[PDB]
Design an enzyme around this catalytic site. Structure first.
Site, short mmCIF file in Angstrom:
data_model
loop_
_atom_site.label_atom_id
_atom_site.label_comp_id
_atom_site.label_asym_id
_atom_site.label_seq_id
_atom_site.Cartn_x
_atom_site.Cartn_y
_atom_site.Cartn_z
N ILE A 255 -61.78 -1.40 -33.02
CA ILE A 255 -60.69 -0.59 -33.71
C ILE A 255 -61.06 0.78 -33.31
O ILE A 255 -61.94 1.34 -33.70
CB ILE A 255 -60.91 -0.82 -35.05
CG1 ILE A 255 -60.75 -2.55 -35.40
CG2 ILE A 255 -59.69 -0.40 -35.82
CD1 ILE A 255 -61.39 -3.35 -36.67
N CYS A 256 -60.07 1.25 -32.82
CA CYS A 256 -60.00 2.84 -32.54
C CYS A 256 -60.91 3.82 -33.53
O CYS A 256 -60.12 3.86 -34.79
CB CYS A 256 -58.65 3.51 -32.14
SG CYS A 256 -58.74 5.17 -31.85
N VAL A 257 -61.83 4.25 -33.27
CA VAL A 257 -62.69 5.26 -34.13
C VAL A 257 -61.90 6.42 -34.58
O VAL A 257 -62.08 6.78 -35.71
CB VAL A 257 -64.11 5.63 -33.39
CG1 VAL A 257 -64.88 4.67 -33.04
CG2 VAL A 257 -63.87 6.54 -32.27
#
Ligand code: NA
Length: 151
Positions: free
Chosen positions: A89-91
């Site tokens: 999941i996009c940091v």
């Protein structure tokens, strides 16, 4: 461990509270042996292309939790702008307004909310982000089909 004793306490208590009183649509499945690895399910919200799916995911409490958000992965396969090829999941999205007083509950709410309102400007899934912005109906259709198979 490599986590301060007060972080251990706070994590353990917050995980207990999540077992008893999680956000709607969310369930947590703590591992008695590894405090740092937490399995979660999130119901695909109604009124989204993920409706009716149950999305398995996990959080890994990294080096610098809570200075940085946990690392998140979808274990259930998904077509979403912000979820990469390994389910990461996009940091950068998870880090928005992050401070060390935030915990697991905020991370899980942020992920649940991301199913409703993706952020295609930070796309790990380049095709998902593009379709969402350019041809939403085709984004939604692809996401619904994958949800039927994997959710
Ligand atoms: Na958005």
């Amino acid at each position: 461990e490599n986590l301060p004793p007060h972080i251990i306490r706070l994590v353990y208590k917050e995980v207990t509270t999540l077992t008893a009183d999680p956000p709607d649509g969310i369930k947590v499945f703590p591992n008695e042996e590894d405090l740092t690895d937490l399995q979660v399910t999130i119901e695909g919200p109604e009124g989204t292309p993920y409706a009716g799916g149950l999305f398995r995911m996990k959080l890994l409490l990294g080096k610098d939790f809570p200075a940085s958000p946990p690392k998140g992965y979808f274990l259930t396969k998904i077509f979403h702008p912000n979820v990469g090829a390994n389910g990461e999941i996009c940091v950068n999205v998870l880090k928005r307004d992050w401070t060390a007083e935030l915990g697991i509950r905020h991370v899980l709410l942020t992920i649940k909310c991301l199913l409703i309102h993706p952020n295609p400007e930070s796309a790990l899934n380049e095709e998902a982000g593009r379709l969402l912005l350019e041809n939403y109906e085709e984004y939604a259709a692809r996401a619904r089909l994958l949800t039927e198979i994997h959710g």
